[PDB]
Amino acid sequence: KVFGRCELAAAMKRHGLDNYRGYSLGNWVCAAKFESNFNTQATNRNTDGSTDYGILQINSRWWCNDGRTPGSRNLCNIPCSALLSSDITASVNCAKKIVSDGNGMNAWVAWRNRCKGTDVQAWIRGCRL
């Protein structure tokens, strides 16, 4: 599924991401835009042979099992395919664990290099939330 902007903002809020660990909803929408372009089925292979999955491009080295990432963990206890679902629940619940890991949203390099410090509120501008 390819979410609309305000559609995703609403889904993220419904699933409790809005101000989660102090990150306003625009931060989460911004990160999703640059990670996946709001596409739940987005995948991207990393140089190190892990793969990133879903709207928040969650990596198989630590967070999900894909069966093909040596020496990896599965800290969210989910198959990485669950992160491709039209229903964003698995992604959101795993993002909550990631953002709690110590480095906040810096865990998403695209967030650090495209969203951090910007007027992220623009991402929810005009949305019925």
Swiss-Prot record:
- Supply the InterPro entries for this chain: Glyco_hydro_22, Glyco_hydro_22_CS, Glyco_hydro_22_lys, Lysozyme-like_dom_sf
Supply one GO BP term: defense response to bacterium
Subcellular compartments: Secreted
Question: Which Pfam families does this chain map to?
Answer: Lys (PF00062)
Q: Which residues form the active site?
A: E35, D52
Q: What is the catalytic activity of this protein?
A: Hydrolysis of (1->4)-beta-linkages between N-acetylmuramic acid and N-acetyl-D-glucosamine residues in a peptidoglycan and between N-acetyl-D-glucosamine residues in chitodextrins
Please provide, in alphabetical order, the Gene Ontology terms of the cellular component aspect for this entry: cytoplasm; endoplasmic reticulum; extracellular space
Its EC number(s):
3.2.1.17
Alphabetically sorted, this entry's keywords are:
Allergen, Antimicrobial, Bacteriolytic enzyme, Disulfide bond, Glycosidase, Hydrolase, Secreted, Signal
Give the protein's biological function. Answer: Lysozymes have primarily a bacteriolytic function; those in tissues and body fluids are associated with the monocyte-macrophage system and enhance the activity of immunoagents. Has bacteriolytic activity against M.luteus.
Which protein family is named in the record? Belongs to the glycosyl hydrolase 22 family.
Which proteins does it associate with, and in what oligomeric form?
Monomer.
Anything else known? Lysozyme C is capable of both hydrolysis and transglycosylation; it also shows a slight esterase activity. It acts rapidly on both peptide-substituted and unsubstituted peptidoglycan, and slowly on chitin oligosaccharides.
Q: What is this protein called?
A: Lysozyme C
Where does this protein come from, organism-wise?
A: Gallus gallus (Chicken)
